[PDB]
RNA sequence: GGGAGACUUGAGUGCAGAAGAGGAGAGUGGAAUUCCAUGUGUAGCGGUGAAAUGCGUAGAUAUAUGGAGGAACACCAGUGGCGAAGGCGGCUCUCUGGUCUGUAACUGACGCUGAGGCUCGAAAGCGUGGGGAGCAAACAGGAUUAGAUACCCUGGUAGUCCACGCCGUAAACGAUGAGUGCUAAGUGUUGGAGGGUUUCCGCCCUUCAGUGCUGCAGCAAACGCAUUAAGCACUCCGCCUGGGGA
């Protein structure tokens, strides 16, 4: 299998059971696909270098995530998050 | 795709057409069928009252569901199949409770595709939503001007609209013909495009083609007599002859907007084109 | 897959160990060749990887060249197992 | 003196944005390699985890 | 790839006397054997000794220089190519320097020198001059 | 040369490692330009050797806020890397080729070259359909000039980008075919490997394969080439036979 982690911004405003549903909801989203989300944390809440969608302030949460490269769990993350408006920004990437 | 056909004649010379591979079965349901009969561009006076317009092959209609209001349960597409009445095909769909139903195909459509309409459904291809619900960016099609009426916008074979953001309660879109202009946020629309692109590249071929059709023949007005249209007259071949080229009833042909200057979708139209 | 080679490898064998031998390594690229051919028909345009793909056809016909001057019977027997021309 | 090879880390997190910060100039710019005494290879490195560092946000673009 | 070793032998030697090397080393084969004891016994080469290794074999030649490190061996010549044989009939046997070089041939009697070749009156193949 | 054996060096596979703008597909980030909208704000801005065209009192340039969208990927960056060549530089992921270094388990010459064929092949160009900010043949205007169908300036279409399909040419160059072996050293640098140290980092020694520079013998008409030969040799291929006409 390959491994993904997964750090993406949840706008600061968010709810805190709000972010807890979205965190859940996302974490399903690989689960389903076929991914296997080895480890979630919400890593830090930070300011931004710059803004981002009118943002300087966020909430970096990992996913470190280990999936078979033909499954489309990252791929349908990658979609959903983008459609989704809470996540401002999201990085995966390989980690070996 | 499209197929061209060997010079075998002259008329079958140039030719193309579609070799209808989407096309999964030739037998329209009869529940959906209705009778249609050719106006020919006739009114209820009796005048041709639309010109070039008769003939050609007979047709059934097909009653398809551009108002996509069945959110109780998804509809699973049976099959696609070619529609006489459009330039697109439709897609056959069973409702999980029995309900038979034609919609437009979207580019893309597969048999056995789980579409869902409503609110609730996620963005997929050939589902169908409020305007409101679908996420900025997102190709469209068979959009409703009011809500509760029906798809009337993007129907045409290829064709697709994109959401562009929300403002009060409509929501910015820029249709196939380019224009910018606000929509009601509660009306609907299906995600994606219409399939069936590649009918803009049929080479029609013949005349006798255009005539199943149901176009009969465009007869140029510079040869006409000057009773018949402003360019008629003259001898032997003719220039325009006048101040800008008109209509068979004086109108300017080349250029002249028509749009009612006083529409009051004017306040709803955001940039023009076309 | 390195998984996939080693089993290929084990079948077509010719005794315990045999990793190298014109047997086992015309499978073995006949295996790869009908992969990459299938990358390539979703990839028309990579012709680089598509390169790599001609050299791995030339050399397995080198091989199978030098498998029937020296054994027919082996050559006969692989082209039957492995379906070749 | 190649600082990485010193602290001994062969992975180089995109998001160590502390170490990052002593590779890159005033106005977020990136130091060379040859200026940091660095080698070839931590470079590349640096330079994928700074890159990654600011499409994220974590480092600034400009200024 | 390498398509002649005896022409590689040959040209061995030929740089190994232009840089004056005080030896040189080759892969052991039965015709380069041959090559080396005649130029031995002819006193071109000082010396030849063969050793047994686990590929085929080595052969090791010391050269000789005369006094005042004079080259003994002027050049090599390689005759018969693979790309073109050099078949010599027993009146065609030819002569290096009017004598003073000589010719290695190889025959049904061995690999043999031109003097020798035409003593037993045979042909062979011309393998090489020295001188 | 032919037949029957044997061998492992060449060749390839296995096993353990290494790097990389190699290729393809779909996404995505920031600076900038241009344009759009609205503040502020008034007389120019722009440009040249000097000017003028041009834009600006219908309020320009500038200026702040955003919005739009196209293209290229600053810093890193390096006779650095990769590719057979053309060429490949933002980041992510999916697919994928090749190369190198070990080990020596495997096969046991299976190799080299390669007419004819086939594939790839910068830029421009062509076809269909897209897209189109900047730049920019053509073209327009202002200058220069004896003239200026130019150099210069202000604009600017095709094109430059994308998908598909053609086209198959370049100073497509190292103006140096490929394979192999041999023949002083010195010094850089790329990716590994081993040892001797070193607490580690690191430094010393050996070596594999690139990449530079310097430089022996040798070669050369000279210029220069010199283990990355144009030196010493063998195999195969392509090609040359005075200039013009061409
Ligand atoms: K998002
Ligand atoms: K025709
Ligand atoms: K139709
Ligand atoms: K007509
Ligand atoms: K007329
Ligand atoms: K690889
Ligand atoms: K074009
Ligand atoms: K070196
Ligand atoms: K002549
Ligand atoms: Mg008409
Ligand atoms: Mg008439
Ligand atoms: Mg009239
Ligand atoms: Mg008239
Ligand atoms: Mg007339
Ligand atoms: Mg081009
Ligand atoms: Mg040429
Ligand atoms: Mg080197």
Same mark, same amino acid.
């Given at each position: 299998?390959?491994?993904?982690?997964?750090?993406?911004?949840?706008?600061?405003?968010?709810?805190?059971?709000?972010?807890?549903?979205?965190?859940?909801?996302?974490?399903?989203?690989?689960?389903?696909?076929?991914?296997?989300?080895?480890?979630?944390?919400?890593?830090?809440?930070?300011?931004?270098?710059?803004?981002?969608?009118?943002?300087?302030?966020?909430?970096?949460?990992?996913?470190?995530?280990?999936?078979?490269?033909?499954?489309?769990?990252?791929?349908? *993350? /990658?979609?959903?998050?983008?459609?989704?408006?809470?996540?401002?920004?999201?990085?995966?990437?390989?980690?070996? | 795709?499209?197929?061209?056909?060997?010079?075998?004649?002259?008329?079958?010379?140039?030719?193309?057409?579609?070799?209808?591979?989407?096309?999964?079965?030739?037998?329209? @349901?009869?529940?959906?069928?209705?009778?249609?009969?050719?106006?020919?561009?006739?009114?209820?006076?009796?005048?041709?009252?639309?010109?070039?317009?008769?003939?050609?092959?007979?047709?059934?209609? !097909?009653?398809?569901?551009?108002?996509?209001?069945?959110?109780?349960?998804?509809?699973?597409?049976?099959?696609?199949?070619?529609?006489?009445?459009?330039?697109?095909?439709?897609?056959?769909?069973?409702?999980? /409770?029995?309900?038979?139903?034609?919609?437009?195909?979207?580019?893309?459509?597969?048999?056995?595709?789980?579409?869902?309409?409503?609110?609730?459904?996620?963005?997929?291809?050939?589902?169908?939503?409020?305007?409101?619900?679908?996420?900025?960016?997102?190709?469209?099609?068979? =959009?409703?001007?009011?809500?509760?009426?029906?798809?009337?916008?993007?129907?045409?074979?290829?064709?697709?609209?994109?959401?562009?953001?929300?403002?009060?309660?409509?929501?910015?879109?820029?249709?196939?013909?380019?224009?910018?202009?606000?929509?009601?946020?509660?009306?609907?629309?299906?995600?994606?495009?219409?399939?069936?692109?590649? $009918?803009?590249?049929?080479?029609?071929?013949?005349?006798?083609?255009?005539?199943?059709?149901?176009?009969?023949?465009?007869?140029?007005?510079?040869?006409?007599?000057?009773?018949?249209?402003?360019?008629?007259?003259?001898?032997?071949?003719?220039?325009?002859?006048?101040?800008?080229?008109?209509?068979?009833?004086?109108?300017?042909? =080349?250029?002249?907007?028509?749009?009612?200057?006083?529409?009051?979708?004017?306040?709803?139209?955001?940039?023009? !084109?076309? | 897959?390195? &998984?996939?080679?080693?089993?290929?490898?084990?079948?077509?064998?010719? $005794?315990?160990?045999?990793?190298?031998?014109?047997?086992?390594?015309?499978?073995?690229?006949?295996?790869?060749?009908?992969?990459?051919?299938?990358?390539?028909?979703?990839?028309?345009?990579?012709?680089?990887?598509?390169?790599?793909?001609?050299?791995?056809?030339?050399?397995?016909?080198?091989?199978?060249?030098?498998?029937?001057?020296? /054994?027919?019977? %082996?050559?006969? &027997?692989?082209?039957?197992?492995?379906?070749?021309? | 003196?190649?600082?990485?090879?010193?602290?001994?880390?062969?992975?180089?997190?995109?998001?160590?944005?502390?170490?990052?910060?002593?590779?890159?100039?005033?106005?977020?710019?990136?130091?060379?390699?040859?200026?940091?005494?660095?080698?070839?290879?931590?470079?590349?490195?640096?330079?994928?985890?700074?890159?990654?560092? %600011?499409?994220?946000?974590?480092?600034?673009?400009?200024? | 790839?390498?398509? /002649?070793?005896?022409?590689?032998?040959?040209?061995?030697?030929?740089?190994?006397?232009?840089?004056? $090397?005080?030896?040189?080393?080759?892969?052991?084969?039965?015709?380069? !054997?041959?090559?080396?004891? =005649?130029?031995?016994?002819?006193?071109?080469?000082?010396?030849?000794?063969?050793?047994?290794?686990?590929?085929?074999?080595?052969?090791?030649? *010391?050269?000789?220089?005369?006094?005042?490190?004079?080259?003994?061996?002027?050049?090599?010549?390689?005759?018969?190519?693979?790309?073109?044989?050099?078949?010599?009939?027993?009146?065609?046997?030819?002569?290096?320097?009017?004598?003073?070089?000589?010719?290695?041939?190889?025959?049904?009697?061995?690999?043999?020198?031109?003097? @020798?070749?035409?003593?037993?009156?045979?042909?062979?193949?011309?393998?090489?001059?020295?001188?």
């Amino acid at each position: 299998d390959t491994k993904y982690e997964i750090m993406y911004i949840i706008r600061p405003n968010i709810d805190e059971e709000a972010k807890t549903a979205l965190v859940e909801r996302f974490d399903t989203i690989l689960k389903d696909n076929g991914a296997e989300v080895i480890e979630s944390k919400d890593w830090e809440k930070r300011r931004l270098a710059y803004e981002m969608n009118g943002f300087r302030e966020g909430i970096y949460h990992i996913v470190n995530v280990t999936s078979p490269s033909t499954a489309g769990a990252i791929n349908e *993350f /990658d979609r959903l998050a983008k459609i989704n408006d809470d996540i401002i920004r999201h990085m995966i990437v390989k980690v070996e | 795709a499209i197929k061209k056909y060997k010079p075998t004649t002259n008329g079958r010379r140039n030719m193309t057409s579609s070799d209808f591979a989407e096309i999964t079965t030739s037998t329209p @349901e009869k529940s959906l069928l209705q009778p249609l009969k050719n106006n020919a561009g006739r009114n209820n006076n009796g005048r041709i009252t639309v010109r070039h317009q008769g003939g050609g092959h007979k047709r059934q209609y !097909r009653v398809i569901d551009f108002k996509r209001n069945k959110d109780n349960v998804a509809a699973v597409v049976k099959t696609i199949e070619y529609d006489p009445n459009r330039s697109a095909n439709i897609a056959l769909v069973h409702y999980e /409770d029995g309900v038979k139903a034609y919609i437009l195909a979207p580019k893309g459509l597969e048999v056995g595709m789980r579409l869902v309409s409503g609110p609730e459904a996620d963005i997929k291809v050939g589902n169908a939503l409020p305007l409101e619900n679908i996420p900025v960016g997102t190709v469209i099609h068979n =959009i409703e001007m009011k809500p509760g009426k029906g798809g009337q916008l993007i129907r045409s074979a290829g064709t697709s609209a994109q959401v562009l953001g929300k403002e009060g309660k409509y929501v910015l879109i820029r249709l196939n013909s380019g224009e910018v202009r606000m929509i009601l946020a509660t009306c609907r629309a299906t995600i994606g495009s219409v399939g069936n692109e590649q $009918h803009e590249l049929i080479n029609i071929g013949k005349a006798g083609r255009s005539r199943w059709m149901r176009k009969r023949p465009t007869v140029r007005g510079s040869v006409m007599n000057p009773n018949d249209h402003p360019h008629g007259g003259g001898e032997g071949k003719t220039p325009i002859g006048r101040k800008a080229p008109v209509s068979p009833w004086g109108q300017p042909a =080349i250029g002249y907007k028509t749009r009612n200057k006083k529409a009051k979708s004017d306040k709803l139209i955001v940039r023009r !084109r076309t | 897959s390195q &998984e996939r080679k080693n089993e290929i490898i084990k079948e077509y064998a010719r $005794h315990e160990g045999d990793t190298g031998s014109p047997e086992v390594q015309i499978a073995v690229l006949t295996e790869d060749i009908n992969q990459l051919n299938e990358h390539a028909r979703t990839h028309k345009k990579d012709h680089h990887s598509y390169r790599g793909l001609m050299k791995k056809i030339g050399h397995r016909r080198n091989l199978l060249a030098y498998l029937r001057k020296t /054994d027919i019977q %082996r050559y006969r &027997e692989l082209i039957q197992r492995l379906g070749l021309r | 003196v190649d600082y990485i090879a010193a602290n001994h880390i062969e992975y180089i997190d995109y998001k160590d944005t502390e170490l990052l910060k002593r590779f890159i100039s005033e106005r977020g710019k990136i130091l060379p390699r040859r200026v940091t005494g660095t080698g070839a290879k931590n470079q590349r490195k640096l330079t994928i985890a700074i890159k990654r560092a %600011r499409i994220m946000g974590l480092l600034p673009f400009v200024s | 790839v390498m398509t /002649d070793p005896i022409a590689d032998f040959l040209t061995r030697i030929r740089n190994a006397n232009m840089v004056k $090397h005080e030896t040189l080393e080759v892969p052991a084969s039965k015709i380069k !054997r041959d090559i080396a004891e =005649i130029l031995k016994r002819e006193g071109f080469i000082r010396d030849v000794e063969y050793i047994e290794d686990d590929k085929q074999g080595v052969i090791r030649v *010391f050269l000789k220089y005369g006094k005042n490190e004079e080259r003994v061996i002027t050049n090599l010549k390689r005759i018969s190519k693979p790309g073109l044989r050099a078949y010599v009939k027993a009146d065609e046997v030819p002569k290096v320097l009017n004598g003073l070089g000589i010719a290695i041939i190889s025959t049904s009697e061995g690999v043999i020198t031109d003097k @020798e070749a035409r003593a037993k009156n045979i042909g062979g193949e011309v393998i090489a001059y020295v001188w």
